[PDB]
Amino acid sequence: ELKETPSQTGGPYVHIGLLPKQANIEVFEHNLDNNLVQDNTQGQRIRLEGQVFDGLGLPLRDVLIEIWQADTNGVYPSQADTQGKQVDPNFLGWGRTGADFGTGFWSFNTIKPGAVPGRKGSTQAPHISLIIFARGINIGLHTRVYFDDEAEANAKDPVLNSIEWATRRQTLVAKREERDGEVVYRFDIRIQGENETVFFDI
Amino acid sequence: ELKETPSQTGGPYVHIGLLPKQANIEVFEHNLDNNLVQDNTQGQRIRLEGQVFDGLGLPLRDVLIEIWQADTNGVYPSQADTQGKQVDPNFLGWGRTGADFGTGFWSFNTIKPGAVPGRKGSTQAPHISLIIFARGINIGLHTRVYFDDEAEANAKDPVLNSIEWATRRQTLVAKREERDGEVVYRFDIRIQGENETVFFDI
Amino acid sequence: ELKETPSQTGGPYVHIGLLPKQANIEVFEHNLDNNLVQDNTQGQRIRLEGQVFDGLGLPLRDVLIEIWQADTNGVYPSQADTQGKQVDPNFLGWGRTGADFGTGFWSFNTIKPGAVPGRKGSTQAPHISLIIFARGINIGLHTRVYFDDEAEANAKDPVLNSIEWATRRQTLVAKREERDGEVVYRFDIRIQGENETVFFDI
Amino acid sequence: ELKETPSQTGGPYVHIGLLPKQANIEVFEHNLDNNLVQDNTQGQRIRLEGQVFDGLGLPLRDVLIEIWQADTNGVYPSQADTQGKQVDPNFLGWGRTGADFGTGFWSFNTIKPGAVPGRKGSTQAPHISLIIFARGINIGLHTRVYFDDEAEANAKDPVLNSIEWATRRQTLVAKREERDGEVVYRFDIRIQGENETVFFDI
Amino acid sequence: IIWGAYAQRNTEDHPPAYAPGYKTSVLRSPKNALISIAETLSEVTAPHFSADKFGPKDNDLILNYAKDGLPIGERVIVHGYVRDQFGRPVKNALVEVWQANASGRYRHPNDQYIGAMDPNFGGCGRMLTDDNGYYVFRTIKPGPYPWRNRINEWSPAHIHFSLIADGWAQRLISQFYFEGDTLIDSCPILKTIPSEQQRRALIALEDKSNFIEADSRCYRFDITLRGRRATYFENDLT
Amino acid sequence: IIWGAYAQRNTEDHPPAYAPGYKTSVLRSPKNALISIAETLSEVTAPHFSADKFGPKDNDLILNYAKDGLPIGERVIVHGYVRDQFGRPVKNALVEVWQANASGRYRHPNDQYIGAMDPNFGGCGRMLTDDNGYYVFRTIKPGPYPWRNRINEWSPAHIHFSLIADGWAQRLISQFYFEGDTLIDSCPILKTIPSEQQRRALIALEDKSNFIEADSRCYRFDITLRGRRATYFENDLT
Amino acid sequence: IIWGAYAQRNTEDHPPAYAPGYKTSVLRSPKNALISIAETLSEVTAPHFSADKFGPKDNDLILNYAKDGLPIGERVIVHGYVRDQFGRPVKNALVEVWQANASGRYRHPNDQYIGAMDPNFGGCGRMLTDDNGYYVFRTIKPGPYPWRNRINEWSPAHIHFSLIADGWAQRLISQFYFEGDTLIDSCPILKTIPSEQQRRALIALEDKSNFIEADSRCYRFDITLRGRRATYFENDLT
Amino acid sequence: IIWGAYAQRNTEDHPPAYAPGYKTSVLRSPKNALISIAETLSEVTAPHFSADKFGPKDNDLILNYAKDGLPIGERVIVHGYVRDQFGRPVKNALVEVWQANASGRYRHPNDQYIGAMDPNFGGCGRMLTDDNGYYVFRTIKPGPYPWRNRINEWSPAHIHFSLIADGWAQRLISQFYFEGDTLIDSCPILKTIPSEQQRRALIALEDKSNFIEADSRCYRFDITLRGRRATYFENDLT
Ligand SMILES: O=[N+]([O-])c1ccc(O)c(O)c1
Ligand SMILES: O=[N+]([O-])c1ccc(O)c(O)c1
Ligand SMILES: O=[N+]([O-])c1ccc(O)c(O)c1
Ligand SMILES: O=[N+]([O-])c1ccc(O)c(O)c1
Ligand SMILES: [Fe+3]
Ligand SMILES: [Fe+3]
Ligand SMILES: [Fe+3]
Ligand SMILES: [Fe+3]
C-alpha cells in the first residue's frame, strides 16, 4: 500500500494556477469560474456570497473557494453517482472563485440543490460542499452550506445531527435574503475564535 | 525505583465500572453512591450541586465526580489522619456521582466539614477535595470547594493564598443558598476559557 | 518464485467445514457428499468401502476421505483432461465422506472407472485416486485403489510397476465381493505397521 | 519464573545412592526399602511383583522402582491430602526396590489401597502410582497399577477412561494370584514393543 | 516511621491534558497550567472500604451477571500486584474494572455499536488487594472497540481500571491492554502517553505457567502508584 | 501453451509425517517413505464446482447460521489471493473454511470444552475464487482452543481452510493465524513446520486500510499452491 | 465491483493545521478539532472535465505564454503517475500547476520580489491524466523564492499542483521539489509535514534516461491520492 | 491459599526419551507418546521423611564411610537452594546423592574400571532441605568416568542426585557437573538435553567466598522443581 501525498498550503499566489484571470494572466481560452448556471440549467437560481475571517476577525483577501453540489433533483453530475437517475445535462456541479483582493468578498452563481440520499436509507437536507484554500492553511478546509429556509429538512439531516455540540450546527446554515428579486444566501466563514465554523474531515 | 502507572481517560462508559446503576447494571448488592450522610452522622447537612462546562460553555453530560472530606470536627475517617482525635464513626468521608445524561447536573448529600490543620501549625479553611473524570480528560482533575460563608477562614487559607493570581481564587468558592430550609452550595466547574476553575497538581 | 503454503493437519473437527451434516450443522442447501452416481450416469455401479487403521490396529473414527476418478470411458470430468474425448456429462468424478464415529466404516457409491492413458503411450489399469485427512496426519496421504478383477491390466500398470518392493503392490488392490447383486470393493487402509498401505508423493 | 531442572538418567549405579544395601554399602542405620507394612498397619496385605522388559523382550536387571499409594481407606499419608480424614498412622505410603541383578525380578510388600476421590466429585478405582528409573531412561517413567479384581471400579475410573485406545487400558491391570494364602499381584512392565505399558506425563 | 508527603507526580510520565490527536481533549483540557501545592492531611488521607460489603462474585465477570448460561468469549484470569513507587505493597486498595464484551460492545445506554450484546455478561467487577498488594479477577477477553475520533478509529482490546488506595494523591484511573494486540501501535488514546516505556507499562503479559488446562488463559499485570517518603527530621505535614 | 507436470512438492517446506511433539501423529504416520511418482492425467486433473449451487450467505459466517440475532464476537473480514508457485492466479478454486466460535468452542459433537456455544454461530463457509484468484469471507474472530496434547496445550486463534483447485496434486488443507497472537510461538502443531519462514506464511496480516468504520476489522491472507511447468519440447504426460 | 467509501485520511501523514513555525497558520487554523463524518454520495462524487476544452499548449509552460521569443531558464520535462493508495491508476484527473519563473519571480499582482519578470513566461498549465494515470508537462525550472516568515526565509525551487479526481474526498493541493536542492532541509512549510518519509514523497527525481539531448532534462514525480474500498457485504453508502 | 495442580512439565526443557546418541535409550524408550492426565490427589501428594531417622554423618561423604583414615581426593562442600518454578522454597525435601570416588571409580558390584577403589570412601549421602530450601553436604570431588557408549566415551566429573519433595509430580533424578570441566561439551548424556540454557542449569559454580582456608573448596548449585498454582475460583482437584 501507498501513503497519500502530503498536503501543503496553496500559498498567496494560488490564483496563478487556479484563477489566472484574477492574476491577470490570459493563457487559456476556456477558464474555470464561479458560474455554475448555463442557459438551459434547471432549478432556482441563487447567489451564494460571504467573506472568510481569520482569528483577528479580519477577512482573508487571498482565499480561494470551490463548491461541489447536486442538481435541482439531488443527482450529482458524476459517474460515481449511483442513483440511476438522469442528471441535468447542462450542469457541471462545481465552480471556483477567489475573494476580491481589496474587500475579501467572494460569490458564486448557482442553483439550489435538491435533497441527496444519505446513508442507510436516510435523506440529507439540501447542501453545498465547500472547500477553502489559502496561504496559512496547510490542508484545504471542508465545510457544508445548508439553507435557513429548509428548517424541517435540516432538523433531520444526518451530518448536522452528528455534530454533538448543537450550538455549532448553526454555523453551517446560510441566511436567505432577497436583493431585487434575486435570491441570495450569505455564508460567512470564521476560521478561528468565537462562532468558529464547523470543518469536516471527509 | 518504579514509575507510576500512566493515567488514561476514563472514557464515556466509566459508569459501567464506577456507577453501574447509572448504566442500568444491577450486579452488586452494595453500590457506592453520592450520599455521605448516615442516620447518626454528625454535623450540618448540606447539598453540593452544579454542572461542569467545556470550552464552548456546554455542560459535560458524561462526567463522573468524587469528593473526599473530613467530618464535622475536621478529622478524616482515614488511618493516615494523625490528629489523634476520634473521627465521627458513621462517616465514610467519600462519595461518587455522575452528571445526569440529559442535563449535566450533579449533586452530593453530605455535611459541612470542620477546619483541618494545614502545614507548620496553620489551619486550613473548611473545604471539600473534588476530582473529575470523563471522556476527553486524560488525567483526573483535582480542585477544592470552599464555602462563601467562611470568608474569614478563606482569607487566611494557606492553599488559596498560594494561588498568585488572586482573581482566580474566587473560582473555588461555592455559593450558599437556602432551598426550602435545605442548605445548598452551588459549585459550577469551568474546564476551560473565561473564569476557568483552578485545578491542582496534588 | 513462491513457496507452497505449508500443510497442517485437518484436526478432529474437519467435519464442520467439509461434511457439516456429519457435525449436525445444516447451513448449506447443497452439500458435497459420497454419492458420485447421478440418475443418468453411465457405467457399472459399485460400492467402495473399508476402514483406516492406526499403528495399534485400531480404526480411525475421525478420518475424512476423498476420491477422484475418471468416467466409465477413462475420461476425467476436468478441463485439464487432454484426450479430446467427450466425458460423461452426468459425472462429477469426485466425492467426500467421513468414517462413522462409532465404527470407523466409510463408503462411496460410484462407478468403476475406465482405463486412462499413462505417460509416453502407456495405458494405466483402472484406478481411483484417494486422499485421507485426519487429526494426527500433517499432510493429506495420497494412495490409489486398483481392482482385483483387473489382474491383467494391473500387471502392466506403470505406477504399480514402479513400486520396487513387489510385495507392497498388493496393498493397493481392493477385493471384489457381491452383496445381494451389488458389487462391493473392500479397501482397508493401514497407515503404519505390517501390511502398511503404499502412500504416494504425487 | 524459573525452568525446572532437567532430568538425566539415573545410570546403572543408581543403587549406590538410593539402595546402598544392594550395592553392598553399609553406611546408614536406617535404610529405605520395599516394605510398606508395619506391625500395626491396617488393611489387606498383598505382594506386588513383576519384571520390566526392554524392546528385545529382555528384563532390565538394573532398574529401580518406587511406588506411592494411599492407605486402606484411600487417604494419603501427606500434608497435601485435603480429605479431612485421619490417615493410618503406621503407614508411610511409599517404598523403593531394585530388580535382582540376576533375574530382573522386583517386589514390594504393601497393602491394597482404598479408593481415592477423583476430580470434580468422581471416585478413582484403587491404584498404586509407580515410577521406574534406570540406565537408558532419561526421565523417570510414570505408570499406575490397577487390580483385576476391581473390575467394576476400573470400568468407571476417570484416568483409565481417558486413554482413548481402549486396548491399551489392559496393560495397567495387575493379575491377582494366591500363593500359599498370600495374595500376589503380578504386574510386568513392557517399555517398548507389543503390549507396551501405558506411561503418563503427570 | 513517620510518613511525610507523597513524592511529586512526574508529569513527563503521563499524558498532557491537551492532546489534539485525541479530539475530545481539545475542549476538555484546562488552558491554565495546574497549580502545584505542598501536601496536607487532605491529600495524604483516603477512605477505607470493607470487604464485608462485597459479594462473592464481585471479582468474577464470568459469573456475576450470568442468568441463563455462561457469557460467550475467551475465558481469562488477570492477576498482579499493586505497589507504590518505592516498591512497597499497597494493601486493601479498592480496584474497580469495566470493559466491553467479546464483541467489543459495552453494556451502556450510549453505546450503539452493532457488535452483539451478550445477555449473560455485564462487564464490571471490583476487589480489594490483599496484604501483599495482590489482586485477581476472572473475565471474558474484550473485543477491540471502533469509535469516532477519526471515522475509522479502533481501540485495542482493553480493560479499564480505577484505584482508591491510601492517599487521595494516589487516585488513579487508566486501562491495560493484552500482549501482542496489533492495534496498540495505532491507538490515539495510548499515544497521548509521551514515552515508549510508559506505553509499555500498560500491557498485560501472557502468563503461560498460570493457565488452567481446558479452562482459562491468564495475564499478569502490575500497577504502580505514587509512594510516600519517610521523615526523619522536621515533620511539617502538620 | 502445452502444460506439463506440476513442480515437485518441496518436502522441506512442509511438516514431516512423524512429529513426536504432536502426539497423535506417532501412530498415524507411515513408517515407510512416500513413493514418488511421475505425474499422469490422474494427478493433473481435478473436479469443477459451479457457483450456481452456492447459497448467498455461504461466505458469510456472521449471518449464515444466524437465527434470533447476531453471533457474539469480533466482526472481521478475511480476504486475499490464491496463486500458484509461479505467481499465476488460481481461478475458480473451491475454498472451504471452519473454525471455533468467539469462546474457542467448536460446533462439533466431540468438542466438550466449557467455552460457551453461540446459538447464532455455525463456524463453516465456502466460496470460489474469482478470475484474479481473489477470495473474501466475513466471520467472527475465533478464540484460542485448549486441547489435550500435553495437558495444558492451547492453540492460537485460527481458521482452518481447504482448497480444491485445478490439479489433484494441488490438494491442500492448512490453517492460518492472526498477526500478533502470542500463542503462535508455543503451538506444537505449528511447530511441526521446519522453517521459520514457512511458519510465518500461515499468519494473516492486519489490513488497516480495509477496516470498515464502526463495523468490521480486516485481515489479508494469501495462499500459494503448486504450479504447473509449460512444455516446449516432448510432452510425455500422455 | 460495488465501491464503498474512501479509506480514512491518515492525519499523521499530513501537516497539522496549527504549525507555529509557519507563522501565517497561527491565525488561519481552527481551534476546534475537525469533525469526522461517515461518507455519503456527496463525498464520493466529483466533477468531470473534458479534454475538448483544453488548448494544445495548456501543458507547455515553455510556449503557452511565449510572445516574442522563448522564456529564459532551464528547459525541463516533468512526468509521472497519479495512483490511489491501493495502487490503481487515477484516470482523467485534472492536474493544475503554477510556479515562479527562472528568477524565483511569480507573475502575480502581489509579488514584489526584485527577481526579474520574464515577458515570455506565465507560469501556469493544466492537463488531464490518461488511462494509465500518466501525466507530462514541460516548463522552465523555477528559482527558489525569498519571502517573509522569518525575514530571511527562502523556499526551495518548487512547482505547486492541484488535483481534482474521482471523489471530492480526494481533493488535494501540494507542491513538489527537485532532487538535491539544499534549501529543502530548511523550509518551514515543508517542515510542517511530521515525518521524514512523507517529506521525501514531495521530491521529484532526476530521470536521466528520459533527458532529450541538446534540449531538456527530465524529472519523475508520482502522486498518490486516497483510494476507495470495495464492498462485498452490506452497502450502506445509500 | 487453596492449591490447585502443578504446572505442566515443559517437555522441551528435558531430554526426549528416545535419544540415539545415548545408545542404551534405543531399547529402553517407549515408542508411544506419554499420555498426559489432569492431576488428582495421587499426583499432588508425596511421602514425608523425618530427620530423626538420619545419622549425623549422612551428609558427610568424607567421613561417613571412613574406617582407617580419610578418603583420598579434593575436599569440597556443595550447597544451594531447592525452589519451585514460582521461586518458593521447597522445605524438608529428601535429597539423595551418589558419585564415584577421586579415581572415577564407583563402589558398585558392576563397575570394573581400573581406577582405584578407596577403602575410606563410600560415595552416598542424603539430607533434608531446611525451611529456606537450603541444603549442604561435603564430599571428595569425583573423577570423570570412562564407559562404553562409543568405546572411548568419558563423562565429566559429576554427582548424581534425586529429590522427593511435596508432590509426586515433582519426583526428579538428575546430576550436576563442576564449572569449567572440558568434558561437559562432549558428553552424550548431557547432550540429550535440547537446549543450551538447560544444559547450563546442571553446572555447579565455584563459590570462592565460601572456601574454607587450608581445608575445602565450595560449589554453589541450585535446583528448581515444578510448582503448584493457587486456585481462586473453582477447585476441581476434588
Ligand atoms: O468513544 N467511545 O465511546 C470509547 C472509545 C474508547 C473506549 O475505550 C471506550 O470505552 C469508549
Ligand atoms: O484436539 N483438538 O480437538 C483440536 C486441537 C486443535 C485444533 O485446532 C482443533 O480444531 C481441535
Ligand atoms: O509568501 N509568499 O509569497 C510565498 C511563499 C512561498 C511560496 O512558495 C509562494 O508561492 C509564495
Ligand atoms: O555406563 N556406566 O556405567 C555409567 C556411565 C556414566 C555414569 O555417570 C555412570 O554413573 C555410569
Ligand atoms: Fe473502553
Ligand atoms: Fe482448530
Ligand atoms: Fe510557491
Ligand atoms: Fe555417574
UniProtKB/Swiss-Prot annotation, chains A, B, C, D:
Superkingdom in the source lineage: Bacteria
Alphabetized GO MF terms: ferric iron binding; protocatechuate 3,4-dioxygenase activity
Annotated metabolic or biological route of this protein: Aromatic compound metabolism; beta-ketoadipate pathway; 3-carboxy-cis,cis-muconate from 3,4-dihydroxybenzoate: step 1/1
GO biological process: beta-ketoadipate pathway
Entry's cofactor comment: Binds Fe(3+) ion per subunit.
PANTHER family associated with the record: DIOXYGENASE, PUTATIVE (AFU_ORTHOLOGUE AFUA_2G02910)-RELATED, PROTOCATECHUATE 3,4-DIOXYGENASE ALPHA CHAIN
Subunit structure: The enzyme is an oligomer of 12 copies of the alpha and beta chains.
Annotated function: Plays an essential role in the utilization of numerous aromatic and hydroaromatic compounds via the beta-ketoadipate pathway.
Similarity comment text for this entry: Belongs to the intradiol ring-cleavage dioxygenase family.
Name of the protein in its database record: Protocatechuate 3,4-dioxygenase alpha chain
Organism this protein belongs to: Acinetobacter baylyi (strain ATCC 33305 / BD413 / ADP1)
Gene designation: pcaG
UniProtKB/Swiss-Prot annotation, chains E, F, G, H:
Sequence intervals crossing the membrane: none
GO biological process: 3,4-dihydroxybenzoate catabolic process; beta-ketoadipate pathway
Domain of life: Bacteria
Cofactor or coenzyme needed: Fe(3+)
Pfam families given in the database record: Dioxygenase_C (PF00775), PCDO_beta_N (PF12391)
Keywords of this entry: Aromatic hydrocarbons catabolism, Dioxygenase, Iron, Metal-binding, Oxidoreductase
Chain segments annotated as coiled-coil in the UniProt record: none
InterPro entries, alphabetized: Intradiol_dOase_C, Intradiol_dOase_core, Intradiol_RC_Dioxygenase, PCDO_beta_N, Protocat_dOase_b
Record-annotated disulphide pairs: none
Binding positions for Fe cation per the UniProt entry: 106, 145, 158, 160
Top class in the EC scheme: oxidoreductase
EC number(s) reported in the record: 1.13.11.3
Pathway listed: Aromatic compound metabolism; beta-ketoadipate pathway; 3-carboxy-cis,cis-muconate from 3,4-dihydroxybenzoate: step 1/1
An annotated Gene Ontology molecular function: protocatechuate 3,4-dioxygenase activity
Swiss-Prot/TrEMBL catalytic activity: 3,4-dihydroxybenzoate + O2 = 3-carboxy-cis,cis-muconate + 2 H(+)
Cofactor note: Binds Fe(3+) ion per subunit.
Function: Plays an essential role in the utilization of numerous aromatic and hydroaromatic compounds via the beta-ketoadipate pathway.
Self-association state and partner proteins as the record states: The enzyme is an oligomer of 12 copies of the alpha and beta chains.
Record family assignment: Belongs to the intradiol ring-cleavage dioxygenase family.
Name listed for the protein in its UniProt record: Protocatechuate 3,4-dioxygenase beta chain
